[PDB]
Design an enzyme around this catalytic site. Sequence first.
Site, PDB file in Angstrom:
ATOM      1  N   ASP A  74      -4.963  13.787 -25.586  1.00  0.00           N
ATOM      2  CA  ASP A  74      -4.940  12.367 -25.260  1.00  0.00           C
ATOM      3  C   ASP A  74      -4.096  11.622 -26.309  1.00  0.00           C
ATOM      4  O   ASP A  74      -4.602  11.207 -27.353  1.00  0.00           O
ATOM      5  CB  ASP A  74      -6.374  11.824 -25.173  1.00  0.00           C
ATOM      6  CG  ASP A  74      -6.428  10.344 -24.809  1.00  0.00           C
ATOM      7  OD1 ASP A  74      -5.370   9.684 -24.757  1.00  0.00           O
ATOM      8  OD2 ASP A  74      -7.550   9.842 -24.594  1.00  0.00           O
TER       9      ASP A  74
ATOM     10  N   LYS B  40       0.042   0.995 -25.599  1.00  0.00           N
ATOM     11  CA  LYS B  40      -0.142   0.970 -27.048  1.00  0.00           C
ATOM     12  C   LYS B  40       1.215   1.125 -27.762  1.00  0.00           C
ATOM     13  O   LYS B  40       2.081   0.257 -27.636  1.00  0.00           O
ATOM     14  CB  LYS B  40      -1.182   2.008 -27.490  1.00  0.00           C
ATOM     15  CG  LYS B  40      -2.578   1.798 -26.876  1.00  0.00           C
ATOM     16  CD  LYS B  40      -3.590   2.828 -27.373  1.00  0.00           C
ATOM     17  CE  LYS B  40      -4.982   2.584 -26.791  1.00  0.00           C
ATOM     18  NZ  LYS B  40      -5.085   2.918 -25.346  1.00  0.00           N
TER      19      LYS B  40
ATOM     20  N   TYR C   5       0.841  -1.195   0.000  1.00  0.00           N
ATOM     21  CA  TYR C   5       0.000   0.000   0.000  1.00  0.00           C
ATOM     22  C   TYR C   5       0.877   1.246   0.000  1.00  0.00           C
ATOM     23  O   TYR C   5       1.778   1.388   0.838  1.00  0.00           O
ATOM     24  CB  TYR C   5      -1.003   0.014   1.172  1.00  0.00           C
ATOM     25  CG  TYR C   5      -2.433  -0.099   0.690  1.00  0.00           C
ATOM     26  CD1 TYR C   5      -3.029   0.949  -0.022  1.00  0.00           C
ATOM     27  CD2 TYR C   5      -3.175  -1.262   0.904  1.00  0.00           C
ATOM     28  CE1 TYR C   5      -4.348   0.850  -0.498  1.00  0.00           C
ATOM     29  CE2 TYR C   5      -4.498  -1.372   0.439  1.00  0.00           C
ATOM     30  CZ  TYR C   5      -5.069  -0.316  -0.268  1.00  0.00           C
ATOM     31  OH  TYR C   5      -6.356  -0.431  -0.741  1.00  0.00           O
TER      32      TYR C   5
ATOM     33  N   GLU D 148      -0.536   4.738  -0.942  1.00  0.00           N
ATOM     34  CA  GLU D 148      -1.350   5.949  -1.171  1.00  0.00           C
ATOM     35  C   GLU D 148      -0.513   7.192  -0.912  1.00  0.00           C
ATOM     36  O   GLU D 148       0.274   7.232   0.042  1.00  0.00           O
ATOM     37  CB  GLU D 148      -2.570   5.995  -0.253  1.00  0.00           C
ATOM     38  CG  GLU D 148      -3.606   4.919  -0.488  1.00  0.00           C
ATOM     39  CD  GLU D 148      -4.766   5.021   0.476  1.00  0.00           C
ATOM     40  OE1 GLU D 148      -4.622   5.669   1.531  1.00  0.00           O
ATOM     41  OE2 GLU D 148      -5.831   4.468   0.175  1.00  0.00           O
TER      42      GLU D 148
ATOM     43  N   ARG E 128      -0.153  -2.379 -19.091  1.00  0.00           N
ATOM     44  CA  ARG E 128      -1.465  -1.764 -19.194  1.00  0.00           C
ATOM     45  C   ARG E 128      -1.674  -0.769 -18.048  1.00  0.00           C
ATOM     46  O   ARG E 128      -1.622  -1.141 -16.876  1.00  0.00           O
ATOM     47  CB  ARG E 128      -2.534  -2.849 -19.218  1.00  0.00           C
ATOM     48  CG  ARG E 128      -3.918  -2.385 -19.621  1.00  0.00           C
ATOM     49  CD  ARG E 128      -4.785  -3.594 -20.039  1.00  0.00           C
ATOM     50  NE  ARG E 128      -4.251  -4.216 -21.239  1.00  0.00           N
ATOM     51  CZ  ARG E 128      -4.552  -3.859 -22.486  1.00  0.00           C
ATOM     52  NH1 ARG E 128      -5.417  -2.884 -22.723  1.00  0.00           N
ATOM     53  NH2 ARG E 128      -3.985  -4.486 -23.503  1.00  0.00           N
TER      54      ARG E 128
ATOM     55  N   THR F 211      -2.168   6.212 -22.379  1.00  0.00           N
ATOM     56  CA  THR F 211      -1.965   4.880 -21.842  1.00  0.00           C
ATOM     57  C   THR F 211      -0.482   4.567 -21.996  1.00  0.00           C
ATOM     58  O   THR F 211       0.236   5.242 -22.746  1.00  0.00           O
ATOM     59  CB  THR F 211      -2.816   3.833 -22.588  1.00  0.00           C
ATOM     60  OG1 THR F 211      -2.541   3.900 -23.991  1.00  0.00           O
ATOM     61  CG2 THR F 211      -4.307   4.105 -22.363  1.00  0.00           C
TER      62      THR F 211
END
Lengths: 405, 405
Positions: free
Chosen positions: B197, B226, B51, B53, B232, B223
Amino acid sequence: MKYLPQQDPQVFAAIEQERKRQHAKIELIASENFVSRAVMEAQGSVLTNKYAEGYPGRRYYGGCEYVDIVEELARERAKQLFGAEHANVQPHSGAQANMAVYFTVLEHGDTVLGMNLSHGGHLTHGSPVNFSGVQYNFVAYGVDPETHVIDYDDVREKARLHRPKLIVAAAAAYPRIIDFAKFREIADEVGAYLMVDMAHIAGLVAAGLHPNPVPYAHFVTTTTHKTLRGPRGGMILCQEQFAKQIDKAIFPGIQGGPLMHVIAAKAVAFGEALQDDFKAYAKRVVDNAKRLASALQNEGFTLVSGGTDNHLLLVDLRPQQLTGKTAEKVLDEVGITVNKNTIPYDPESPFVTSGIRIGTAAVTTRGFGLEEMDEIAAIIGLVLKNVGSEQALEEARQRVAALTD
Amino acid sequence: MKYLPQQDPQVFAAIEQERKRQHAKIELIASENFVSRAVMEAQGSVLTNKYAEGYPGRRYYGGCEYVDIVEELARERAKQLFGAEHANVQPHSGAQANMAVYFTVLEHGDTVLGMNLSHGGHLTHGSPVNFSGVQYNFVAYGVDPETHVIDYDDVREKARLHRPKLIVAAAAAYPRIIDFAKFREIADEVGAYLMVDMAHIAGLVAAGLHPNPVPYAHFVTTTTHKTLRGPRGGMILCQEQFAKQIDKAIFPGIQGGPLMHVIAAKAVAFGEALQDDFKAYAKRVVDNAKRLASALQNEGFTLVSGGTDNHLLLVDLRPQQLTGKTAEKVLDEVGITVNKNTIPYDPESPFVTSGIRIGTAAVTTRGFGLEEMDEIAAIIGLVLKNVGSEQALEEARQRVAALTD
């Protein structure tokens, strides 16, 4: 690893540091666990290469035959674990699982009733700096100031006053069993949907050690990575009547391409949870938490609610005149990882706090039992009662090392 | 794999099917690629257990020293790749990267101007079944009906009429270079933020083969999976003035715990992209796409915009009196993976379409060159000109197998 050490020395060195850190420290962060090598292998698979928007047999890309089998294995095993009519295994996280349920049943500005964030509620249950509190009108129910148990009359009164469209039950820091039958009764009275966020207790539910919210909730959300001991991600369970709506909320609603490799890892984790030895594990988690609670009380510590029914406990540090921040810091110095955590009716800000949150899921996974719980409690007492003594902290350091070997 | 085959025969069998499928088929899905073994190893690491955060040096959990090094490596390498003042490497996906930018600068119901979805715009750029179109008031600019190039006068007119708070540039299916200078000029005229984008073209931008949006955009989303050939996930780049706001949008805004193992994999992918051989790779992608376009035209096919400047092309199938759906299906029968895709001013619904979208990123990664492009074009011609001939489809099947070996 074979290829990463050669390709990327910098990333590999830091991963290896992290791997060694995970073994050396006593990890008592209540939301953490250690996944199996099988789970990690699934996450490290070629499935990351596959675009698979949509659902099994209903994808918007060809070539999904085999990822469909994987996703279906995840959904069917989840339904087997929890007895849900429908599962959605695509949420990227607990945040997104909640986001999708909200997206399904709520319009912008709708009233939602959730657990007071300072009494154990999660960020995604209405924090004004989170999408939940910005997009929706969140009101809160509290725990009793004495017992620290959810006040169900307060849940009811808040529901009847504010008329929420949705009631949220479950918590990031609540050490007692939650009465889902009572939440649904209140939801029924006011005509609200009931959402249970079982993220913390999901493994305990699967092992029959916490009552199952599925029969009582319209929607159940969870992470896969806490007590369920799976990869990092989310999941939604719901009755059949909401299946189509929930699926559409996740996609095309709030996400794009699912993480098929993580979904593979989810299936693996669910397979593990279906085994008898997971049930034994989960009982040891709860048993260890009880033992740890008792042992801390023996050391003179006060616990929120006077103990625990689950994997987690909260120490109220006010009798020792310490903040959670101070306790967190000093425990970090000796190799014990906890987090500061607000206690109910905390006089301190959430950045300081009067408490520490502790969980046993991680240490139980690495095989700690009752004797180790006693010793962890003894070390915490030694440290927190002698914050100014470097000799005491060194003894603690040595005793921590003795435990992790 | 060592542990997954034993722990979970069912999941392992399906993964192995998928692994074999990825090698056997000619993958022309424009958004797909094949990651390195190093990238996968990073995703398969123990970092899933942590974790974390918050942000490097500013976390809300102790024990993040080493995951901080990993995240920083990702951010610094991304800034090196794209020349951005700030990077956020935590977005779980392209969807969430966009979601966070919208969350940063927009209020519920604000007007946004994006590319017409049927002319190449993405789902997250205002689809009425996506959070973007439900939460915000999206208006659209189009491409010219003849050239299929973005009509910048239409971008300008829509902007001046609708007065958007935000203009979105970039696409899921646009085969030509986008003029970011012109988008920013229009944004400046109407006092709108500009978001680019670059998900599809991110690897091409990194290799200097597509103009870089960073100098012109307030926010750049992408992303990592690609043309950038990474794991991913998503990423946001922005100028320093928006850094704090963007970080807070991701957390505590729209996400919870980041996927530290995927962030490790991002760092690895960015390290790979910084190498000279990635630049050579990306040029072969563009070269291959040009060659494929030319070869398809030689076979008698009409292409949207008359060709390509990037990794992707769209076949307008109307001259052959085929729908994209029919072409997709028959190509699937012979082992070629494409997707149906709406063409500009398509007379067919998005579930049927008059086009197929094709990209060269994946086949280039596996080492296909110009000769293979000619043959892929020849096979597509053979199939689409003989949809009713099982003998032709078998010949295609054999020629596909000859290519993938």
